[PDB]
Amino acid sequence: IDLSALNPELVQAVQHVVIGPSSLIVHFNEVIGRGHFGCVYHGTLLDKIHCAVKSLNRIGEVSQFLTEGIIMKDFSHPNVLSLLGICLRSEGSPLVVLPYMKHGDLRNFIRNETHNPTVKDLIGFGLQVAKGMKYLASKKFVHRDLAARNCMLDEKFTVKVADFGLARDMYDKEYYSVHNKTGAKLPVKWMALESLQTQKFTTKSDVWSFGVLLWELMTRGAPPYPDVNTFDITVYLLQGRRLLQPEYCPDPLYEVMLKCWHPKAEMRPSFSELVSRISAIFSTFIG
């Protein structure tokens, strides 16, 4: 680490993000996650806390890497995945240390035959995601890749918006398509009309993605637009089409989704308004 290279004011924060090699025991033997940029393994962190250790070696400016960690550690919210820190290993790229999420990613959880979340439960997961996104949006942070696959659940079934900062990766390559002109691999079925056209992402395009995530929840993890092929989604939507109302999605919740998919970005609801609206719908259910 070169503390001279960093922003002078961020030098203090480094001792809080850096995890000493002796503090962390990473179990490389068993793999719990597969990403494009690297695998993730079981980890034991001295404090004994169970954690997930992500490799990034499958890096760039080290000063930039550390600052990314510092920003990420400053986030603290029950529905946002935290960063426990970064462990530097001599011989290999640095490791990202995240809290262990017992019940995997949200999409696989709702697709699990052995778990039977109620309609209320699924609306509840939707609310938690809206809450985490409200926090992140207030921090002027733009996720760019909000989807059910990219949220995770701890032992208490608490839903945390994940897959951002140093944890950012492609964890299911099927849903990422190569753009023609710029080669970027984009999650086109979660993307807002404008983002498909310009590749510019905003909080308002996160809101569109959140609409699709609500749909995944209500369909219990069904793939959006199966009958559609990659970048043909712009044409499909422009025909005047949206995802259909899932069988058990409450009418008010479908209206929420449609609002999230408003043609005008600025007319989509804020994450605050979504929290409000969804909490009300949630409150009408029992069980």
Ligand SMILES: COCCOc1cnc2ccc([C@H](C)n3nnc4ccn(-c5cc(C)ns5)c(=O)c43)cc2c1
């Ligand atoms: C035995 O299965 C238990 C789940 O294993 C874990 C536990 N905690 C984790 C915490 C973070 C992560 C990595 C770094 N991560 N961070 N954000 C995300 C978002 C989605 N995903 C995944 C999505 C999918 C479809 N497979 S993995 C992540 O792995 C992830 C993986 C874990 C895997």
